Amino acid sequence: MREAICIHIGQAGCQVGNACWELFCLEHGIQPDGSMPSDDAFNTFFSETGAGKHVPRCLFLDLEPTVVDEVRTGTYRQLFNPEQLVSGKEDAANNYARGHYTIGKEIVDLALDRIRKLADNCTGLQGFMVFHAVGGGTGSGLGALLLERLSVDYGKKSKLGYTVYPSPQVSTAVVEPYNCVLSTHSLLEHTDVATMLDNEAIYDLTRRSLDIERPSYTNVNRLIGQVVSSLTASLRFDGALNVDLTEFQTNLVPYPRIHFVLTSYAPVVSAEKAYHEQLSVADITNSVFEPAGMLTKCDPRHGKYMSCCLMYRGDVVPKDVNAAIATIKTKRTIQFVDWCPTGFKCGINYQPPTVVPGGDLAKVQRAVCMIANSTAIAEVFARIDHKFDLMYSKRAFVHWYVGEGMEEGEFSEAREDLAALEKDYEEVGAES
């Protein structure tokens, strides 16, 4: 029961999965072989076999084989299924057209077959969680294709896209705004909740809260996996206020088109500083709501919050979270929209957040992750469309798309989708 199927698309998704699956294995006591040396809670992320092994409900997809072969030769080779770990032969080259038109259909059928096998195995499938990067080709192309096929094949199943976006100034691609603006078309219609996972905010969090001189994708993906585990632990473990996928779906999405959400996590402290500060529920809530303690480069003080969901883990108390809510509401720096008087969905889980050894998080008795739908998120679109327009004025880097089966107009539908995506956020944020 309460099974959720994890899907990873592109290199970014593959690394995010390779960083969250060892966290899940540590949480549920699963060795890389897939056994417990020395209670049904792993069923959400692991499928039981009569031999005692626990195969994850994970799909790995990438048009290029380097990352999947690294996974196949890694420590978790005996854990991961040889199938559902699929590979292509030529990458998308950050070409949404290549990933969605030419190379997409030759692997999408296999991907849907493996997802069908996973869903058949899952007898209580709660939904799908897809990890990809909109800035890439496979993340945008194969991401859009898989989103469309899953939406047309599985009805109204909950779908959570924990997706990485082009950061405001630290980005590693030039056609990346093109890929983002093109993937938005799928991420509006076929995605139930999308979670912003840019890289600059993670970098700043690591450099200003962990004092790590040289952190990298290993650290950022460990933090992403920690956020995902914090969000999903509500159903895998008991708690005072458990939540379900559809439950916070309803609590978070006010309108069908308003589903892009900021994310934040606390207390993210080092081992040296773990045993010094007073890491109470109120303190961690304040750290959560601080602009610098989140996972996306989007300052909420320029916008207005619409719905905040607070997943507390450990020995947290409902009155502690109530006091945190009261202090937050009294605090005027953050603004709540006028038509949402409550605006808070808090859940409590009794399982403390496990820390993977050798990482940056330190073993802390309690933590909290916030998923916030807010009007401030219009800024990421307002800058990504500006970046897209600076190249689309005379459309550089578009012959690559055109030669891969892309019509010239698809960019125009991308631009109109961005326009409407900013406009409905402005409308909902406008005072009555």
Binding site: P32, E70, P357
Partner: protein, 412 residues
Amino acid sequence: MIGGEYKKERFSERLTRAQNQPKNRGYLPDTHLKTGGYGTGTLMGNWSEERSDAGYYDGKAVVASTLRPVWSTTYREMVQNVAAPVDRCDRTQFSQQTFMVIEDRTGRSYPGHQPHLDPEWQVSIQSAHYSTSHSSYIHPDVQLQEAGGKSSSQSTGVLLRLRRQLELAQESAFPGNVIRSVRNALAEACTDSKGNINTNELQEGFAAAGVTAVPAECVALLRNFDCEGHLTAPYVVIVDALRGEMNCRRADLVEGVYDLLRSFSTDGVVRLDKLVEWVDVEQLPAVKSGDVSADAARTAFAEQWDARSATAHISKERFADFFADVSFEIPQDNTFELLLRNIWHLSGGRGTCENTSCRRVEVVHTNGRVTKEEIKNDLLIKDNGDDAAVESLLHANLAKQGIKDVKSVRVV
């Protein structure tokens, strides 16, 4: 390097009539590496960069006659003090294999590369053997396993590291065996009469005691603690530094214990036989739990007292060091105070550290008043088999304390 064989013309070049081009090795006449138009000796222009090459042979002989040995300059005679004497980046220790590889200029990432002169080549190759994700996602068990300006700062860091390693090793009928065995191992490793130990003796002393010490570790220890300037220091100061300075509270307790023992001494002098007769080893945690017997506890007590005679004299420093070992290997001040007060019947302490060894007495006075009193300092008042004698001793102690109107005493 000596001789310069790798710069000399090789057999392949003779057998193929090979010439200076394209392998500019310079073995043939008129093929030397002229920089500036002058030899590597006439140092102009690119001379320093040329001499920095791994396969460079200076051309100066290593044996010089002593009948015209006057050509030194001011800088040479100023730096001869630090100049190294003459017999993985030692060109002298390099073999002809590596020298001819360098001459052939193979296995280089870019032109002008010096893999052999690079000292981190081995670790670079080992790192290149692994990927970032593979090294990041090592199996959790072995991954968890892999987790100032003062002159004495480095040595005090050494002492801290050794102390924490000894604490981890700790985590013995009577306490003190850790420092006892460390001192014994250093004494055994000694080969000098006055207690002076060199680096190798110190290293193998730690090895016998159960401590992993680097030769550099030992050399740092001896260089800090040396006073005669022979890279040699007494072992007593090293052992005391490893044990650490005594805490104020525990030192005060030890001073009180010694004062009580001195008062109880028959002649006013603390003696080993009275020490071991007065110690109540029955109240150790191990003895209470039944791990060890009282006889074994007393035998160990004497054994790490290390007295050369059964009737030896115990003084300030001896008592302080002996219980400083116990203080070092017991981490909690409260439990150390409780244990010491329990062993030596010192009335006092507050709360958890309050003494429980002394016999509480219900005393009825001449007027019928019943009071629950505590006897103080009853080391010699033991079970001698005579109830009348014990009762009289209790009355004498109470009268000395100040309660003189007693009429009956019962041990609770």
